[model samples]
Target: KVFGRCELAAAMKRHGLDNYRGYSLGNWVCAAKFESNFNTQATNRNTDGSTDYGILQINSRWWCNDGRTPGSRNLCNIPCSALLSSDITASVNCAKKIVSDGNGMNAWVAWRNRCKGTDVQAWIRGCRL
Candidate 1:
């Protein structure tokens, strides 16, 4: 499933992505837009044979146990398939773990390259939050 910008914003904010680790809803929304275009089932293969899953594109290398990554840590302690669910709860929870683990929002290259140092708030400008 894919979410509209406002829909994604509302859902994420409800899950506490708004001020998670000092990153705002705009930051999370911006990364999701670029990472998966708000598509829950999105997947990207990595050079190391790992995969990025879901809207946040959490990586299989460190976050999830995809079984395809030989060195996976599964630090999130969840299956990679959980990230692909349309409910997004598991993905959000895992993302919170990523931030709390000191990776910050920069764990997503899309966020670092596009959302970082820019007018990220614009991503949520029209949202009624």
Candidate 2:
């Protein structure tokens, strides 16, 4: 079966998180949610009128600079791009990588411990990914 952009975005919104800060699922979701509300067509313009594009809110200028397609690289490769082409499986894989990479999850844990209650572990458990 194939997943459309909206379907994939919905799944990511449902499973993706937003309570952490660095590399956790929630952290990545936070950026994605904030940037595009999980809407793949979402775009915005800065004062200079340059366009930012996609659910991950990648800027056209930056993305175009590499001459590579948005979906070509891994999510973590570009620091702020989703790497997946509105594919649910791809999005999940990207999220998994952030969680697997110690640094990624660590950032969110630290943020949670500092700002929220010291219950990051519990929060992680609830996220289930």
Candidate 3:
């Protein structure tokens, strides 16, 4: 499912992503915009043969197991397929784990490239949350 921007904001907020690791809802929203365009099934194969999955594009290289990544830690302890679901809670939880693991939001290049250290609040403007 492809989420509307505000809908994605509300969903992420509902799952406790608001200000998770000091990154605001807008920061998360902005990252999601660039990572997956709010589409739940998004995936990108990396040059190293790992794949980024779902709305936040969690990577198979370390986070989730796709059964193909060469040395996956599966630190999130989930199948990569879980990230593709429209429920989004799995992706949100995995994102939280990524932050708490000390990688910070920089684990996502999209977030670093587009959402970091900018006026992130603007991304959530008028979203009423």
Candidate 4:
């Protein structure tokens, strides 16, 4: 279960991502809406018969290993399954890291625009928060 909005805000603040700027809460919320409709338990299947898990839809096979935490990749290492388990703070932080990395969020934004693509500079310049 995820936290309520106030709790979510506190968690975001603790992760240093609640502010209005690049990789801010607004951006993350928008990304989440696009990614999983804000549903933390969302899952998807890959062609290889593996699963992508959680709000960020991280691929389980790529991240998780056998007999360990589900979706625990060294590259994005965190118990990603725990993201949907009970720790919404961990989920927010993990997503913040991915969004702050630039590449993943950029791709997400592009996908959000249906691949028509928006100007990154313009988007940042126009971002209110």
Candidate 5:
């Protein structure tokens, strides 16, 4: 399901995640745009034969069970499909766990490539939510 950008920004604000783990809110928002364009059902296959989870584009190489690969370790303790729901609560929770365990927003290639040194004021500009 494609979601509105403002909706996500507001939800993140309500959850006190706008500057989560010290990364700018724009990093997450911009990364999500590249990862899934706010579509919860978005999935991608890596050249190395792993799959990415939902909006955050978490890779199955370390996070989820893709079924085809052996030794699929699900550290998030949630099915990869759970991340593909229109409702983003579970995905958001899982993301928090990931950021806590790893390199935070830097774990996302989208964040590294697109949102690095990016200003957030433009992202949340007029929403005022």
Candidate 6:
């Protein structure tokens, strides 16, 4: 499990996830806090017969596959389990591709539902970044 939010922000910055592709790091962190609480192993059985993966909650319908599920587009070309790693390079990279795929932060439901128009500053409030 992750120790806390500050460290998560640090790690995201180190991996260039902070402010990458015009999206603020705070929004990313905010989305993560709601989506998975920074747990890399987090997974969810979506009501639409799909699954969400990792801290970023990349979806199986296009991003990754859990194998037990059917009809994964796997656009990121990664096994869904790979995203569950404490080492998050694969997750970060795949998320980059997702961001470039034109969704921006809209790729994440948590962002639209929780982070939208909120004070993003609070997400990184305790971080040194």
- Local distance difference test values of all predictions, in order: 0.91, 0.44, 0.92, 0.52, 0.77, 0.85
Q: How well is each residue in 32-106 modelled by candidate 1, as lDDT tens digits? A: 999999999999999999999999999998999988899678988999999999898999999999888767877
Q: Is candidate 3 or candidate 5 better by lDDT?
A: 3
lDDT of 2 by residue, 1-89 (tens): 23333343346556554333334443444445445566655656645544555555454343422233343333344433343355444
Alpha carbon deviation, residue 103, candidate 5 (Å): 1.8
Which tens-of-lDDT digit does each residue in 10-104 have in candidate 3?
A: 99999999998888899999999999999999999999999999999999988999999897779999999999999999999999999888768
Name the better of 1 and 4 by lDDT.
Answer: 1
Pick by lDDT: which candidate is best? 3
lDDT-sorted candidate list, best first: 3, 1, 6, 5, 4, 2
As for TM-score, the candidate ahead, 1 or 6, is 1
Whole-model alpha-carbon lDDT for candidate 4: 0.52
Q: Kindly list the per-residue Cα lDDT of model 4 for residues 93-128, writing each as its tens digit.
A: 555555555565664542466322433233223333
Error of 3 at 59 (Å): 0.4
User: By TM-score, how accurate is candidate 4?
Assistant: 0.58
What are the models' TM-scores?
0.96, 0.41, 0.96, 0.58, 0.89, 0.92
Q: Whole-model lDDT, candidate 5? A: 0.77
Model 1: residues with Cα > 4 Å off, grouped in runs: none
- Per-residue error for 70 in candidate 2, Å, reads 19
Location of the lowest summed lDDT over 10 successive residues in candidate 3: 101-110
Q: Any runs in candidate 5 off by more than 4 Å, and if so which?
A: none
lDDT for model 2 comes to 0.44
lDDT of 4 at 128: 39
What number of backbone clashes does candidate 3 have, counting pairs of residues 3 or more apart or in separate chains? 0
Per-residue alpha-carbon lDDT of model 6 for 41-122, expressed as tens digits? 8988888889888889889888887676676688899899998899888888998999888878888877998998899988
